mmCIF file of C-alpha atoms and ligand atoms in Angstrom:
data_model
loop_
_atom_site.group_PDB
_atom_site.id
_atom_site.type_symbol
_atom_site.label_atom_id
_atom_site.label_comp_id
_atom_site.label_asym_id
_atom_site.label_seq_id
_atom_site.Cartn_x
_atom_site.Cartn_y
_atom_site.Cartn_z
ATOM 1 C CA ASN A 11 12.043 -17.141 13.231
ATOM 2 C CA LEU A 12 13.718 -15.949 9.964
ATOM 3 C CA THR A 13 17.264 -14.666 10.776
ATOM 4 C CA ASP A 14 17.990 -10.908 10.301
ATOM 5 C CA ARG A 15 19.917 -11.799 7.062
ATOM 6 C CA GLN A 16 17.014 -13.983 5.704
ATOM 7 C CA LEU A 17 14.517 -11.103 6.462
ATOM 8 C CA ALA A 18 16.826 -8.657 4.571
ATOM 9 C CA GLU A 19 17.094 -10.952 1.483
ATOM 10 C CA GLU A 20 13.242 -11.470 1.419
ATOM 11 C CA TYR A 21 12.527 -7.706 1.808
ATOM 12 C CA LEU A 22 14.982 -6.691 -0.953
ATOM 13 C CA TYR A 23 13.412 -9.329 -3.298
ATOM 14 C CA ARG A 24 9.717 -8.669 -2.523
ATOM 15 C CA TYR A 25 9.877 -4.857 -2.954
ATOM 16 C CA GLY A 26 11.998 -4.859 -6.213
ATOM 17 C CA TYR A 27 15.519 -3.869 -4.939
ATOM 18 C CA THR A 28 17.193 -7.208 -5.941
ATOM 19 C CA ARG A 29 15.775 -6.958 -9.552
ATOM 20 C CA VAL A 30 17.132 -3.386 -9.956
ATOM 21 C CA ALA A 31 20.558 -4.538 -8.588
ATOM 22 C CA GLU A 32 20.544 -7.378 -11.231
ATOM 23 C CA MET A 33 19.922 -4.770 -13.997
ATOM 24 C CA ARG A 34 23.072 -2.914 -12.674
ATOM 25 C CA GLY A 35 25.317 -6.057 -12.560
ATOM 26 C CA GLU A 36 25.485 -5.877 -8.703
ATOM 27 C CA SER A 37 23.219 -8.674 -7.249
ATOM 28 C CA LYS A 38 25.954 -11.099 -5.926
ATOM 29 C CA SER A 39 26.382 -9.205 -2.549
ATOM 30 C CA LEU A 40 23.780 -7.436 -0.312
ATOM 31 C CA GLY A 41 25.424 -3.948 -0.228
ATOM 32 C CA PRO A 42 24.359 -2.392 -3.555
ATOM 33 C CA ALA A 43 20.677 -3.370 -3.060
ATOM 34 C CA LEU A 44 20.805 -2.012 0.561
ATOM 35 C CA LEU A 45 22.026 1.379 -0.835
ATOM 36 C CA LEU A 46 19.017 1.413 -3.294
ATOM 37 C CA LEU A 47 16.623 0.710 -0.336
ATOM 38 C CA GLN A 48 18.271 3.383 1.968
ATOM 39 C CA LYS A 49 17.883 6.034 -0.810
ATOM 40 C CA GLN A 50 14.222 4.999 -1.519
ATOM 41 C CA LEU A 51 13.208 5.016 2.236
ATOM 42 C CA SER A 52 15.304 8.166 3.243
ATOM 43 C CA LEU A 53 17.582 6.156 5.610
ATOM 44 C CA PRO A 54 21.333 6.898 6.034
ATOM 45 C CA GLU A 55 23.097 5.604 2.832
ATOM 46 C CA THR A 56 25.683 3.227 4.434
ATOM 47 C CA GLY A 57 25.350 0.107 2.194
ATOM 48 C CA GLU A 58 25.341 -1.958 5.446
ATOM 49 C CA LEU A 59 22.682 -4.130 7.167
ATOM 50 C CA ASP A 60 22.814 -1.731 10.122
ATOM 51 C CA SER A 61 20.362 -1.038 13.004
ATOM 52 C CA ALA A 62 18.333 1.682 11.159
ATOM 53 C CA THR A 63 17.997 -0.588 8.039
ATOM 54 C CA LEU A 64 16.970 -3.714 10.086
ATOM 55 C CA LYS A 65 14.436 -1.609 12.096
ATOM 56 C CA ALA A 66 12.993 -0.359 8.746
ATOM 57 C CA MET A 67 12.777 -3.963 7.334
ATOM 58 C CA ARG A 68 10.939 -5.225 10.517
ATOM 59 C CA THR A 69 8.315 -2.386 10.286
ATOM 60 C CA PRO A 70 4.822 -3.386 9.025
ATOM 61 C CA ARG A 71 4.129 -1.865 5.610
ATOM 62 C CA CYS A 72 2.245 -1.819 2.294
ATOM 63 C CA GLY A 73 2.482 -4.905 0.013
ATOM 64 C CA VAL A 74 2.921 -2.837 -3.227
ATOM 65 C CA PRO A 75 6.518 -2.938 -4.531
ATOM 66 C CA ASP A 76 8.821 0.150 -4.363
ATOM 67 C CA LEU A 77 11.259 -0.173 -7.280
ATOM 68 C CA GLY A 78 10.663 -3.213 -9.404
ATOM 69 C CA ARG A 79 8.621 -6.322 -10.144
ATOM 70 C CA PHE A 80 5.496 -4.075 -10.754
ATOM 71 C CA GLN A 81 3.055 -6.027 -13.138
ATOM 72 C CA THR A 82 2.371 -4.680 -16.687
ATOM 73 C CA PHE A 83 -1.218 -3.147 -16.633
ATOM 74 C CA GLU A 84 -3.671 -1.663 -19.242
ATOM 75 C CA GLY A 85 -3.771 2.112 -19.984
ATOM 76 C CA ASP A 86 -1.997 5.207 -18.560
ATOM 77 C CA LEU A 87 -2.888 4.410 -14.860
ATOM 78 C CA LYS A 88 -5.229 7.346 -14.135
ATOM 79 C CA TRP A 89 -9.050 7.510 -14.140
ATOM 80 C CA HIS A 90 -10.761 9.137 -17.189
ATOM 81 C CA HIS A 91 -14.151 9.838 -15.505
ATOM 82 C CA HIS A 92 -15.090 12.003 -12.499
ATOM 83 C CA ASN A 93 -17.413 9.769 -10.395
ATOM 84 C CA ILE A 94 -15.373 6.880 -8.983
ATOM 85 C CA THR A 95 -17.636 4.091 -7.547
ATOM 86 C CA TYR A 96 -16.611 1.558 -4.829
ATOM 87 C CA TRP A 97 -18.078 -1.802 -3.671
ATOM 88 C CA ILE A 98 -17.338 -3.347 -0.221
ATOM 89 C CA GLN A 99 -17.478 -7.009 -1.412
ATOM 90 C CA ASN A 100 -16.973 -8.680 2.037
ATOM 91 C CA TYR A 101 -16.244 -7.897 5.706
ATOM 92 C CA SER A 102 -13.621 -8.738 8.347
ATOM 93 C CA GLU A 103 -15.305 -10.046 11.501
ATOM 94 C CA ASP A 104 -12.838 -7.888 13.572
ATOM 95 C CA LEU A 105 -15.139 -4.733 13.507
ATOM 96 C CA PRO A 106 -18.904 -4.067 13.143
ATOM 97 C CA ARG A 107 -19.992 -3.619 9.475
ATOM 98 C CA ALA A 108 -21.035 0.081 10.098
ATOM 99 C CA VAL A 109 -17.530 0.884 11.560
ATOM 100 C CA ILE A 110 -15.799 -0.710 8.512
ATOM 101 C CA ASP A 111 -18.184 1.243 6.140
ATOM 102 C CA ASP A 112 -17.357 4.530 7.947
ATOM 103 C CA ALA A 113 -13.549 3.855 7.956
ATOM 104 C CA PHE A 114 -13.649 3.483 4.095
ATOM 105 C CA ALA A 115 -15.964 6.577 3.703
ATOM 106 C CA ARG A 116 -13.575 8.710 5.836
ATOM 107 C CA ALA A 117 -10.555 7.532 3.826
ATOM 108 C CA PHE A 118 -12.295 8.552 0.539
ATOM 109 C CA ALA A 119 -13.365 11.944 2.165
ATOM 110 C CA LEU A 120 -9.604 12.684 2.751
ATOM 111 C CA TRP A 121 -8.898 12.412 -1.036
ATOM 112 C CA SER A 122 -12.178 13.992 -2.210
ATOM 113 C CA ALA A 123 -11.250 17.466 -0.736
ATOM 114 C CA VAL A 124 -7.924 17.635 -2.746
ATOM 115 C CA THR A 125 -8.928 16.038 -6.154
ATOM 116 C CA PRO A 126 -11.617 16.860 -8.783
ATOM 117 C CA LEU A 127 -13.021 13.264 -8.308
ATOM 118 C CA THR A 128 -16.065 12.149 -6.242
ATOM 119 C CA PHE A 129 -16.400 8.744 -4.474
ATOM 120 C CA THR A 130 -19.795 7.006 -4.351
ATOM 121 C CA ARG A 131 -20.674 3.639 -2.748
ATOM 122 C CA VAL A 132 -22.442 0.997 -4.934
ATOM 123 C CA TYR A 133 -23.539 -2.656 -4.493
ATOM 124 C CA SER A 134 -22.271 -4.154 -7.851
ATOM 125 C CA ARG A 135 -19.287 -6.140 -9.293
ATOM 126 C CA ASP A 136 -18.543 -3.389 -11.912
ATOM 127 C CA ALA A 137 -17.739 -0.646 -9.332
ATOM 128 C CA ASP A 138 -14.318 1.037 -10.176
ATOM 129 C CA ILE A 139 -12.767 0.189 -6.771
ATOM 130 C CA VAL A 140 -13.667 -3.301 -5.488
ATOM 131 C CA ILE A 141 -12.705 -3.709 -1.765
ATOM 132 C CA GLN A 142 -12.016 -7.192 -0.357
ATOM 133 C CA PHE A 143 -10.625 -8.751 2.851
ATOM 134 C CA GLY A 144 -8.585 -11.945 2.181
ATOM 135 C CA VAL A 145 -5.919 -14.267 3.653
ATOM 136 C CA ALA A 146 -2.793 -15.685 2.002
ATOM 137 C CA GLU A 147 -3.712 -16.627 -1.640
ATOM 138 C CA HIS A 148 -7.047 -14.745 -2.132
ATOM 139 C CA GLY A 149 -7.597 -15.029 -5.923
ATOM 140 C CA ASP A 150 -5.117 -12.648 -7.666
ATOM 141 C CA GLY A 151 -1.754 -14.548 -7.462
ATOM 142 C CA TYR A 152 -0.230 -11.897 -5.085
ATOM 143 C CA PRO A 153 -0.528 -13.738 -1.774
ATOM 144 C CA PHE A 154 -0.531 -12.131 1.678
ATOM 145 C CA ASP A 155 2.052 -13.261 4.280
ATOM 146 C CA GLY A 156 0.082 -14.023 7.502
ATOM 147 C CA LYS A 157 0.198 -11.870 10.644
ATOM 148 C CA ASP A 158 2.215 -8.524 10.472
ATOM 149 C CA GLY A 159 4.706 -7.819 7.595
ATOM 150 C CA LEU A 160 2.645 -6.529 4.639
ATOM 151 C CA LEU A 161 -0.862 -5.275 5.617
ATOM 152 C CA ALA A 162 -2.703 -4.611 2.279
ATOM 153 C CA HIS A 163 -2.174 -3.824 -1.438
ATOM 154 C CA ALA A 164 -4.003 -2.051 -4.289
ATOM 155 C CA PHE A 165 -3.948 -1.842 -8.100
ATOM 156 C CA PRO A 166 -3.504 1.316 -10.200
ATOM 157 C CA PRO A 167 -6.447 2.872 -12.132
ATOM 158 C CA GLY A 168 -8.002 0.952 -15.012
ATOM 159 C CA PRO A 169 -10.459 -1.858 -15.847
ATOM 160 C CA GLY A 170 -11.223 -5.108 -13.974
ATOM 161 C CA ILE A 171 -8.824 -5.813 -11.062
ATOM 162 C CA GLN A 172 -7.207 -2.374 -11.733
ATOM 163 C CA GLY A 173 -8.214 0.182 -9.010
ATOM 164 C CA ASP A 174 -9.108 -2.591 -6.524
ATOM 165 C CA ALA A 175 -7.992 -2.617 -2.831
ATOM 166 C CA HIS A 176 -7.308 -5.775 -0.704
ATOM 167 C CA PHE A 177 -6.735 -5.933 3.099
ATOM 168 C CA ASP A 178 -4.882 -8.840 4.823
ATOM 169 C CA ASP A 179 -7.383 -10.347 7.269
ATOM 170 C CA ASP A 180 -4.614 -12.338 9.070
ATOM 171 C CA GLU A 181 -4.144 -8.840 10.642
ATOM 172 C CA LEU A 182 -6.351 -7.615 13.505
ATOM 173 C CA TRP A 183 -8.238 -4.581 12.078
ATOM 174 C CA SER A 184 -9.143 -1.818 14.517
ATOM 175 C CA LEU A 185 -8.953 1.996 14.552
ATOM 176 C CA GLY A 186 -5.286 1.642 15.755
ATOM 177 C CA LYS A 187 -5.852 1.930 19.542
ATOM 178 C CA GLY A 188 -5.240 -0.883 22.119
ATOM 179 C CA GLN A 189 -4.486 -3.623 19.597
ATOM 180 C CA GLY A 190 -4.548 -3.891 15.807
ATOM 181 C CA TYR A 191 -3.861 -1.655 12.760
ATOM 182 C CA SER A 192 -6.026 1.398 11.850
ATOM 183 C CA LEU A 193 -8.240 0.292 8.876
ATOM 184 C CA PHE A 194 -8.795 4.108 8.230
ATOM 185 C CA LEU A 195 -5.033 4.890 7.832
ATOM 186 C CA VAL A 196 -4.222 1.738 5.770
ATOM 187 C CA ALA A 197 -7.280 2.321 3.501
ATOM 188 C CA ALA A 198 -6.254 6.015 3.007
ATOM 189 C CA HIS A 199 -2.771 4.892 1.789
ATOM 190 C CA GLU A 200 -4.189 2.055 -0.428
ATOM 191 C CA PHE A 201 -6.832 4.418 -2.032
ATOM 192 C CA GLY A 202 -3.919 6.703 -3.038
ATOM 193 C CA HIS A 203 -2.597 3.860 -5.205
ATOM 194 C CA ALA A 204 -6.149 3.180 -6.543
ATOM 195 C CA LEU A 205 -6.099 6.908 -7.742
ATOM 196 C CA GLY A 206 -2.659 6.479 -9.420
ATOM 197 C CA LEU A 207 -0.081 7.559 -6.710
ATOM 198 C CA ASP A 208 3.266 5.806 -6.136
ATOM 199 C CA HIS A 209 5.176 5.493 -2.798
ATOM 200 C CA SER A 210 6.729 8.646 -1.296
ATOM 201 C CA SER A 211 10.339 8.819 0.062
ATOM 202 C CA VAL A 212 9.144 11.426 2.656
ATOM 203 C CA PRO A 213 8.749 9.486 5.949
ATOM 204 C CA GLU A 214 5.910 11.793 7.260
ATOM 205 C CA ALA A 215 3.811 11.423 4.028
ATOM 206 C CA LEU A 216 0.673 9.188 3.904
ATOM 207 C CA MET A 217 2.135 7.517 0.765
ATOM 208 C CA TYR A 218 5.386 6.483 2.576
ATOM 209 C CA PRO A 219 5.205 2.651 2.568
ATOM 210 C CA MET A 220 5.611 1.953 6.330
ATOM 211 C CA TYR A 221 2.613 1.924 8.705
ATOM 212 C CA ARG A 222 2.787 4.836 11.213
ATOM 213 C CA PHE A 223 -0.148 5.268 13.654
ATOM 214 C CA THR A 224 -1.239 8.919 14.116
ATOM 215 C CA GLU A 225 -4.268 10.762 15.567
ATOM 216 C CA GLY A 226 -3.331 13.843 13.491
ATOM 217 C CA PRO A 227 -4.523 14.835 9.975
ATOM 218 C CA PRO A 228 -2.909 12.152 7.729
ATOM 219 C CA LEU A 229 -2.287 14.133 4.457
ATOM 220 C CA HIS A 230 1.050 15.929 3.963
ATOM 221 C CA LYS A 231 2.134 18.497 1.298
ATOM 222 C CA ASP A 232 3.838 15.659 -0.689
ATOM 223 C CA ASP A 233 0.522 13.662 -0.941
ATOM 224 C CA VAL A 234 -1.542 16.735 -2.025
ATOM 225 C CA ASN A 235 1.132 17.723 -4.636
ATOM 226 C CA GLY A 236 1.237 14.101 -5.898
ATOM 227 C CA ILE A 237 -2.530 14.166 -6.657
ATOM 228 C CA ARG A 238 -2.245 17.698 -8.165
ATOM 229 C CA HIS A 239 0.374 16.353 -10.712
ATOM 230 C CA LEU A 240 -2.213 13.683 -11.819
ATOM 231 C CA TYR A 241 -5.728 15.287 -12.083
ATOM 232 C CA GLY A 242 -5.304 19.025 -11.464
HETATM 233 C C1 VP6 B 301 2.593 4.195 -9.276
HETATM 234 C C2 VP6 B 301 1.582 3.392 -10.178
HETATM 235 C C3 VP6 B 301 2.313 3.232 -11.475
HETATM 236 O O1 VP6 B 301 0.357 4.177 -10.403
HETATM 237 C C4 VP6 B 301 1.258 2.125 -9.532
HETATM 238 C C5 VP6 B 301 0.655 2.118 -8.233
HETATM 239 C C6 VP6 B 301 0.360 0.936 -7.547
HETATM 240 C C7 VP6 B 301 0.630 -0.282 -8.196
HETATM 241 C C8 VP6 B 301 0.428 -1.593 -7.818
HETATM 242 C C9 VP6 B 301 1.018 -2.373 -8.878
HETATM 243 C C10 VP6 B 301 1.168 -3.757 -9.099
HETATM 244 O O2 VP6 B 301 2.147 -4.088 -9.820
HETATM 245 N N1 VP6 B 301 0.460 -4.775 -8.467
HETATM 246 C C11 VP6 B 301 -0.716 -4.640 -7.567
HETATM 247 C C12 VP6 B 301 -0.260 -4.839 -6.123
HETATM 248 C C13 VP6 B 301 0.061 -6.294 -5.863
HETATM 249 C C14 VP6 B 301 1.333 -6.710 -6.348
HETATM 250 C C15 VP6 B 301 2.228 -7.186 -5.386
HETATM 251 N N2 VP6 B 301 3.516 -7.666 -5.779
HETATM 252 C C16 VP6 B 301 3.906 -7.570 -7.087
HETATM 253 N N3 VP6 B 301 5.105 -7.983 -7.500
HETATM 254 C C17 VP6 B 301 3.035 -7.086 -8.046
HETATM 255 F F1 VP6 B 301 3.404 -6.997 -9.419
HETATM 256 C C18 VP6 B 301 1.745 -6.617 -7.682
HETATM 257 C C19 VP6 B 301 0.957 -6.168 -8.756
HETATM 258 N N4 VP6 B 301 1.457 -1.531 -9.849
HETATM 259 C C20 VP6 B 301 1.242 -0.255 -9.442
HETATM 260 C C21 VP6 B 301 1.588 0.869 -10.083
HETATM 261 O O1 2HP B 302 24.197 -0.342 13.264
HETATM 262 P P1 2HP B 302 24.494 0.688 14.370
HETATM 263 O O2 2HP B 302 26.011 0.694 14.781
HETATM 264 O O3 2HP B 302 24.065 2.128 13.812
HETATM 265 O O4 2HP B 302 23.677 0.337 15.699
HETATM 266 CA CA1 CA B 303 -11.587 -2.311 -10.561
HETATM 267 CA CA1 CA B 304 0.380 -9.650 6.771
HETATM 268 CA CA1 CA B 305 -8.454 -10.223 10.843
HETATM 269 ZN ZN1 ZN B 306 1.636 1.396 -0.751
HETATM 270 ZN ZN1 ZN B 307 -4.881 -9.032 -3.663
#
């Protein structure tokens, strides 16, 4: 029961819009930050807390920031070897273990066709991409928010926590039918970040930050070109 205005202030802060408005001398009213968000999400650029902007802010999405408050990390944020390993550290009880394993394998198979990298499952803490399910504060100081709102987050390529992918288990994980969010579609978006991709402004793109259920092929031209500009 946040008000529409309280939701707007929280959204603009969480995803980096308020910090950018501060750097431009324009954080004492909502309008300038709203214009930065409408440009970034490809909404009409009104500067108002209008119906299209409120509908966007209420839409479940990725927990990675858009414009600001990104942490300082080690290295140039791409992988420098070909065989990327992953470890499924724990399981949601919402799906059978073999269905969770296959959702992650399918999400990696989407990227493998369009990148010179391979993805291989291991059972070891020193995998490149460690996958975890967690609730609220889950060990990295970037807490989840309970049911709906942000669904998951991931870290850009590098050592340790870098490249890792976390899924909010206060969500109901499914394949996106009946109830719950598609673990396949969320994992596919989060693995893009774990390969070094940013958010897209193209609403149809996999790397757009909002969750959109589809039964169609998830990759768009903007996603494939994004990976091409990283690894060839
Ligand atoms: C586009 C690029 C540069 O490859 C890239 C891609 C994805 C990420 C994810 C982060 C990152 O900063 N975090 C990892 C995601 C969790 C998180 C959430 N809120 C923050 N304010 C925050 F700093 C972090 C830390 N930083 C990133 C940077
Ligand atoms: O905010 P509205 O007037 O576009 O509904
Ligand atoms: Ca890692
Ligand atoms: Ca959540
Ligand atoms: Ca759950
Ligand atoms: Zn994202
Ligand atoms: Zn986390």
